[PDB]
Every structure is written in structure tokens, then in C-alpha cells.
Design a protein around this nucleic acid. Structure first.
Ligand SMILES: [K+]
Ligand SMILES: [K+]
Ligand SMILES: [Mg+2]
Ligand SMILES: [Mg+2]
Ligand SMILES: [Mg+2]
Ligand SMILES: [Mg+2]
Ligand SMILES: [Mg+2]
Ligand SMILES: [Mg+2]
Ligand SMILES: [Mg+2]
Ligand SMILES: [Mg+2]
Ligand SMILES: [Mg+2]
Ligand SMILES: [Mg+2]
Ligand SMILES: [Mg+2]
Ligand SMILES: [Mg+2]
Ligand SMILES: [Mg+2]
Ligand SMILES: [Mg+2]
Ligand SMILES: [Mg+2]
Ligand SMILES: [Mg+2]
Ligand SMILES: [Mg+2]
Ligand SMILES: [Mg+2]
Ligand SMILES: [Mg+2]
Ligand SMILES: [Mg+2]
Ligand SMILES: [Mg+2]
Ligand SMILES: [Mg+2]
Ligand SMILES: [Mg+2]
Ligand SMILES: [Mg+2]
Ligand SMILES: [Mg+2]
Ligand SMILES: [Mg+2]
Ligand SMILES: [Mg+2]
Ligand SMILES: [Mg+2]
Ligand SMILES: [Mg+2]
Lengths: 73, 119, 88, 101
RNA sequence: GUGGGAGAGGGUGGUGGAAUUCCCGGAGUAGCGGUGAAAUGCGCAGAUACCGGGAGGAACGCCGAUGGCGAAGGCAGCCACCUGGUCCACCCGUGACGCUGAGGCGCGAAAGCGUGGGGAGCAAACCGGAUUAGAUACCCGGGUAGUCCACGCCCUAAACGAUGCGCGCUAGGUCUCUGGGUCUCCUGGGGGCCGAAGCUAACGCGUUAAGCGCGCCGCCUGGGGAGUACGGCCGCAAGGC
């Protein structure tokens, strides 16, 4: 499921290798701090593989969440 | 002997029991309740009905302190989690927000054989 | 590691003539460079076996090339050995 | 001589004098390890996704330098000696890899 | 050789967050835990549940796959350094320098051994609670070696694709990872599935052969006795060949 929208088609042309950019990268994380799978991100093998790295980088810098609390329920 | 009137409700639900801690906005416990606080003893503590009784008991104990609105935090998977939520829904308390905080490791520690085939 | 200028230096050093890249002398020279550097890396880091395999392979290659060289031209072989200080 | 990016996070509660002191120490230690500074970006204090050292926010610097490899780790270690310094991340530079082209 | 690429390939040093345990403090009180049901156990010397701080060890959630790398064993947080292999493009250099490989040498999961550290969680043995006709077990509560690190041994395995290595030749289709190009597609390298010819006792295999051939190595010759005895070599021992 979850075919409603994809993250790659949502935004424009952006650098995947830039870990300092929160606004772009936040879109690739889920409701929780988790990194969205391929079907959600719309990325490719290599792209996704790079995104993971730069996201983890940003996480170390305190820019991105490692995890979050889930609301609603 | 406080008069808080706004606070937090922590539901901790395992398959063996359901225990509810109601606290002030800083997280310090005011009252608490469990399957065993109510008359139940054995496996019957892990029951949804028992969770309803626990939630209601904790809630009335809280309203005795003058509690009105709470923020609910849920930890653990088990029967009676959603029934505790459902009881707190209208206990007379107003549930503001519900949140699942259930703690999960990044694969730190080796689980017991019962919980294995994982890490 | 090995930069471009070092490699070029030794290549132009051991060449049989200007323009020569892949003649036996140059190959033995390069292999000697890498072998020496790798052995230095393995004096420390004694626990790294996967690189040591690489070393074995390089040495084997060098030995085969030299064996071929002495089979063909003994003079160039004596020269190459005296120059690189291999075998003794 | 390789091109690296130095990331530094400081205490957001720092006044001007102590902050100027910290940046002075950073510059000094940078040049002491033989790093020429190609460029610098001061992003100021920003919000953190999780509290670092009990603080909800932090002061972000950025540097792009060219330095000898052998000294790199030491440089990082040096920057960690300061108490006011929170995070230091030294990253090898890379050509930007885009998407939707 | 030149230019370019992907990667959990290896070694050293750093560093991050989640969680568990213990300790300190706050708030709070009658149970918690656990099972099919229970009991042991822990808790008024204040536990469980909740908040804040500290200490310490081990493993890295999402990404993550039907994926990648490595000769195999095997390799997964992030950062840097040191280092091995490999692929493509150019068609530049050498000019058969090739293949295989008894013995030797090296590497070799887990368990195990030696000396010294470390020890959160887990846990052979063990100590208990249950279940049972019994229960030296399955289930529950504890728990030592060990699991972790350094150095040195040990040499095994369903060490498995149960398929030795290299080269040439013999329809395609479909999905996939990674290069290049006149980039819907074509052309290399790798991983999968269905299938031509053919092979096979069958199942199946089928350009990643188990097909057609060539070279070199290892191995088999009914079952039990038995991987036993004896001898030899290796090992501190267990034991291995
Ligand atoms: K075998
Ligand atoms: K002996
Ligand atoms: Mg129970
Ligand atoms: Mg495009
Ligand atoms: Mg690696
Ligand atoms: Mg306490
Ligand atoms: Mg008392
Ligand atoms: Mg300790
Ligand atoms: Mg391979
Ligand atoms: Mg395997
Ligand atoms: Mg390389
Ligand atoms: Mg030519
Ligand atoms: Mg010629
Ligand atoms: Mg051979
Ligand atoms: Mg071993
Ligand atoms: Mg071991
Ligand atoms: Mg030992
Ligand atoms: Mg047990
Ligand atoms: Mg235990
Ligand atoms: Mg002992
Ligand atoms: Mg297998
Ligand atoms: Mg195919
Ligand atoms: Mg193929
Ligand atoms: Mg292919
Ligand atoms: Mg047929
Ligand atoms: Mg087939
Ligand atoms: Mg017989
Ligand atoms: Mg017989
Ligand atoms: Mg037998
Ligand atoms: Mg045996
Ligand atoms: Mg055997």
C-alpha cells in the first residue's frame, strides 16, 4: 500500500550528498524518525543508498531525529 | 493534597498485566493502579477487562486529586492496552493526546531464549 | 598511497625507451614499488590477512615476470635485479 | 593534501567574548595542524532534533579546508579537547550528487 | 599504462543514539513478575509503574532487498587514516611472459585451551519452582564457565550451490545490481527466475550447464564392524590428520 505520493516527485532538483539541509531531508523520514523505504521515497538503488548515509550523518550532527514518538492512536 | 488538574497518564501493557500510572505534568507519580490492585490475581490480570478496571480505578484516584485533563502515553504491546485507552476515553477525565512511546532497542542487548530469533 | 607523480617517476625511470609503459622492466619496477609499500603496511597491522593475500599474489606475479626475463635476456635480468636490489 | 569539511557545534549559551575565544582556539588549532582554510560558513544557533548536552539547541560552524591526511584525526581530537565544543565531524569533500535531472 | 566507477572486502584509531542492568535523587504504595494453570523469586530495609542524573558493557533499529563485497571462513551505526581485490572506457605499451598444481607455506565459523584484562545482557554445568507414572527434559526463577578485548594455541563443520580450477563452443525471454555509449535502446561485468538444443535414473540442469569439448588436481569402488583399533605425525590439553 502507501502509493498515495512519492518524495522524489514531490520536490525539485536537490543534492542528496548534502547532510546540512534539514528541509529536504525531513521529507524522507517517516512520522517517526525512521527512514522511509523505497516505495515511499521513490528513489533508486544508488540514490537511496546515498540518502541513508547523509541522513545518518545529519542525525549525528543533531539536525535529524533518530526516533520520535508516534501520535494519535 | 495537591490540586493538579492537568497531567499525564502512562499505560504500561504487557501480556501479563496492565498497569496505569497517573502523574503531574513533570512526570512525578500521583496515583497508580494495576490488574492486581483490583482483585485479580493470576493470568486474569492480563485481561482487557482488568485493564478497564485498572484504568478506571487510577482515574477516580486521580480525580480525587482534582485531575481533569490528561495526556496519554502508551508503552508495550498486549491485551488491554486499547481497552485502557478506551476506559480513559470517558472516565470523566478528558484525554487530550494519545502517544505510543513503546521502547525499542537499536539491537543492543541479547534477548532471552523465549524472545529470540531476533536481536 | 601512490600518487600519479611517483608512479610516473618510476615508469620513466625503468623504461626501455621514451613512451614505454608496459615493458617487463617497468612492470617489475611497479610491482616492486607496490610490494615494498604493502610490506611496510604489513609490518604494522599484522592482523590484516586479506591484504597479505594481495602481497602473495603480487610477489607471484613479479617472480613469473622475472623468471621470463632471465629465460629471455639474462643481461637485462642481472641489470634489473642489481637495480631493484631484489633476490639479494 | 586533501579537501575536507569540518563541522563544529558549540554551546548556544556562550557570550561574545568566550565565543570569540573558542573560534580563536579553533583557528589556531586548525593552522597548527597545517590546514589552509578554503572557506567558512557560520549558520548561527539552530534547533536540534534531540538535546545535545542538556541543550535543546546549538551553535553551528562550518569549514572547508585542505590539509595533510596524516594529521586529520589529530586535528579532530584537538577540537574535542575544549569543554564548550559539543560535536566535531570531519568529512571528506565530495562532488554534489543531484536528483531529478 | 592512462582516465573513471561501485562496494557490510581487510586492519588501526576515534565517535553517536536507542535499549538493558546497577547506583544516586524525586514523586508515589501493595504488589510486581511469571504460566496452560501455577509456584519458586523479588517487594513495607518501599519494589513494580513514572521523572531527572550517573556508571558500565555489549550489539547496531529504520535504510535492508528477491541487494552488495570477499578465495573461502565471512563482512552491516557514523568519521578519518592505512590497505587488498575487482569492473568499464581508450586500443597506448610488453610480445605467449600461459593454465593447473602432489608436497610445502598461509588463511580458516562456533565451541574449546593458555596468560592477562573485562564482565551490562545472555547462558552449558549447577541450584531451585512446576509438569509428569518418572522428568536427570520441554515451561518458570536464579546462575558459573563462556560469550567481549589483547597475545599465543587449537584446524573442525550440513567449512553447502552437498556442484574443483581455467578456456572455447551451443536459442531466447523476464526481473535485478554496477559501468559505458549515437542513452525509448545498444554494448560490458555480476546476481535471480522460466525455458532451445542437449544432458539426466528421475528430480531437475540448461551462456552463472548438470550441454558439447580440451588441460591439470582431488576423490569413489556394497552395508554393518568403524571413522573404531594399531602405528606415525601434529597438539599444553581436548583432540586432530
Ligand atoms: K565434503
Ligand atoms: K607429544
Ligand atoms: Mg499475570
Ligand atoms: Mg530523470
Ligand atoms: Mg568496508
Ligand atoms: Mg529510587
Ligand atoms: Mg512500614
Ligand atoms: Mg560494572
Ligand atoms: Mg566472488
Ligand atoms: Mg554463508
Ligand atoms: Mg581500491
Ligand atoms: Mg597497441
Ligand atoms: Mg613490436
Ligand atoms: Mg595455482
Ligand atoms: Mg578457528
Ligand atoms: Mg571463539
Ligand atoms: Mg579464554
Ligand atoms: Mg533457565
Ligand atoms: Mg537469566
Ligand atoms: Mg576462570
Ligand atoms: Mg547451503
Ligand atoms: Mg538472464
Ligand atoms: Mg547475466
Ligand atoms: Mg546481465
Ligand atoms: Mg528438451
Ligand atoms: Mg531451467
Ligand atoms: Mg564386507
Ligand atoms: Mg566393509
Ligand atoms: Mg555408521
Ligand atoms: Mg572424530
Ligand atoms: Mg569427521
Amino acid at each position: 500500500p502507501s502509493r498515495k505520493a512519492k518524495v522524489k516527485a514531490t520536490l525539485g532538483e536537490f543534492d542528496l550528498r548534502d547532510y546540512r539541509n534539514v528541509e529536504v531531508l525531513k521529507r524522507f523520514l517517516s512520522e517517526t524518525g525512521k527512514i522511509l523505504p523505497r516505495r515511499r521515497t521513490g528513489l533508486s538503488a544508488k540514490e537511496q543508498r546515498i540518502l541513508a548515509k547523509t541522513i545518518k550523518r545529519a542525525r549525528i550532527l543533531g539536525l535529524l531525529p533518530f526516533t520520535e514518538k508516534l501520535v494519535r492512536k | 493534597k495537591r490540586q493538579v488538574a492537568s497531567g499525564r497518564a502512562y499505560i504500561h501493557a504487557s501480556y501479563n498485566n496492565t498497569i496505569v500510572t497517573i502523574t503531574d505534568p513533570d512526570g512525578n507519580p500521583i496515583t497508580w493502579s494495576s490488574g492486581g490492585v483490583i482483585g485479580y490475581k493470576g493470568s486474569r490480570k492480563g485481561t482487557p477487562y482488568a485493564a478497564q478496571l485498572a484504568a478506571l480505578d487510577a482515574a477516580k484516584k486521580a480525580m480525587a486529586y482534582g485531575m481533569q485533563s490528561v495526556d496519554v502515553i502508551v508503552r508495550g504491546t498486549g491485551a488491554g492496552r486499547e481497552q485502557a485507552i478506551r476506559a480513559l476515553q470517558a472516565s470523566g477525565l478528558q484525554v487530550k493526546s494519545i502517544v505510543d512511546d513503546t521502547p525499542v532497542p537499536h539491537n543492543g542487548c541479547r534477548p532471552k531464549k523465549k524472545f529470540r530469533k531476533a536481536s | 598511497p601512490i600518487t600519479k607523480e611517483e608512479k610516473q617517476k618510476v615508469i620513466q625511470e625503468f623504461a626501455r625507451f621514451p613512451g614505454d609503459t608496459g615493458s617487463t622492466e617497468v612492470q617489475v619496477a611497479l610491482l616492486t614499488l607496490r610490494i615494498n609499500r604493502l610490506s611496510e603496511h604489513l609490518k604494522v597491522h599484522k592482523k590484516d590477512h586479506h591484504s597479505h593475500r594481495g602481497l602473495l599474489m603480487m610477489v607471484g606475479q613479479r617472480r613469473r615476470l622475472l623468471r621470463y626475463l632471465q629465460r629471455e635476456d639474462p643481461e637485462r635480468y642481472r641489470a634489473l635485479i642489481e637495480k631493484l636490489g631484489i633476490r639479494g | 593534501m586533501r579537501r575536507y569539511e569540518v563541522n563544529i557545534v558549540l554551546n548556544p549559551n556562550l557570550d561574545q567574548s568566550q565565543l570569540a575565544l573558542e573560534k580563536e582556539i579553533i583557528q589556531r588549532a586548525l593552522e597548527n595542524y597545517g590546514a589552509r582554510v578554503e572557506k567558512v560558513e557560520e549558520l548561527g544557533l539552530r534547533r536540534l532534533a534531540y538535546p545535545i548536552a542538556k541543550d535543546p539547541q546549538g551553535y553551528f560552524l562550518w569549514y572547508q579546508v585542505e590539509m595533510p591526511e596524516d594529521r586529520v584525526n589529530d586535528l579532530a581530537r584537538e577540537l574535542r579537547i575544549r569543554d564548550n565544543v559539543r560535536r566535531v565531524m570531519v568529512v571528506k569533500s565530495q562532488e554534489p550528487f543531484l536528483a531529478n535531472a
